[PDB]
Every structure is written in structure tokens, then in C-alpha cells.
Amino acid sequence: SETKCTLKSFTVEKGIYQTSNFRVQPTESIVRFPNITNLCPFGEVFNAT
Amino acid sequence: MYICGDSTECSNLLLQYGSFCTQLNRALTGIAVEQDKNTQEVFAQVKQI
Ligand SMILES: *[C@@H]1O[C@H](CO)[C@@H](O[C@@H]2O[C@H](CO)[C@@H](O)[C@H](O)[C@H]2NC(C)=O)[C@H](O)[C@H]1NC(C)=O
């Protein structure tokens, strides 16, 4: 059926055809960053007079 | 895959264009079949071994 879709026809003649791909989907997601705990000093630029 | 690497938000934009990807796939498949035919035609002149 995928071959029928990519060939845009209801009848497929004898042969070998290429249909789409086999891209492997990721299982899950990871995020890694340095463990910096101190908040940035935005009070010395915003909360300033 | 070459133009919009595994990104649906890019494949959707590509789909707004024409059938360029299908045309390129057709051309490259024709090239490969032509090379195979050339190799077959040059060497397989006589069929008896
Ligand atoms: C110092 O900066 C902080 C962070 O922006 C301000 O605290 C917040 O201010 C907003 C806007 O008035 C309030 O809605 C929040 O409730 C405040 N608290 C928190 C925990 O976000 C604070 O107002 C600033 N101080 C001065 C004098 O400008």
C-alpha cells in the first residue's frame, strides 16, 4: 500500500521500488547541563537606582 | 532527509513546494538503472559460458 501511495497508482507493475525510509525514532529524551546553583546577579542591574 | 533532517516542521514547509524530491529520486533511480544496464550490456554479450 505504501508503494501504491508513492507511485500514485492503483496498479503496480513487476519490479522493485523505493518507498519512504526507516528513520529510527528516539526512545526518550535526556538533558545534561552543569550543576550551577547560584542565580545570576540580575538584581544588581534591574533592582538598581 | 538531506534537506529537512528529521524535522516535521521542515518537512511541512518542503511539502508546500512542488514534487522536486520525487523528481530527484526519479532521476537518480534512472541513473542507477542506466549504470547497471551499461555494465550488463558491455560484458554479457555472449550468454554461453
Ligand atoms: C527586585 O526584583 C524582584 C524580581 O524581579 C522583584 O520581585 C518581584 O517583583 C514583581 C513585580 O513587582 C512581583 O510581582 C513579584 O511578586 C516579586 N517577587 C518575586 C518573588 O518574584 C522585586 O519587586 C524587585 N524589587 C524592586 C525594589 O524593584
- Where b means 16+ CB within 10 Å and e means fewer, B21-46 reads beeeeeeeeeeeeeeeeeeeeeeeee
Declared resolution, Å: 3.6
Q: How far apart are CA B13 and CA B37, in angstroms?
A: 37
User: Determination method here?
Assistant: cryo-EM
User: In this structure, which residue's CA is closest to atom 24 in ligand 1?
Assistant: A47
Q: Classify residue A21 by its DSSP letter.
A: -
The CA-CA-CA angle for residues B9, B25, A2, to 5°, reads: 70
Question: Quick one: which of A32, A23, A29, A30 has its CA closest to B4?
Answer: A23
Is residue B4 within 8 Å of residue B11, measured between CB atoms? yes
In 10 A of CB A14, how many CB atoms?
A: 4
In 10 A of CB A9, how many CB atoms?
A: 10
H helices of A1-49, in order, are 2-7
Is residue A23 within 8 Å of residue B6, measured between CB atoms? yes
Q: How far apart are CA B14 and CA B19, in angstroms?
A: 9
Helices and strands, counts by H and E, chain B: 2, 0
Q: How far apart are CA A27 and CA B4, in angstroms?
A: 21
Quote the ligand 1 centre to A39 CA distance (angstroms).
15
Size of interface A-B (CB pairs under 8 A): 5
Asked if B29 lies within 8 A of A23 by C-beta distance, the reply is no
Question: Quick one: which of A17, A14, A24 has its CA closest to A3?
Answer: A17
Residue with cell 533511480: B29
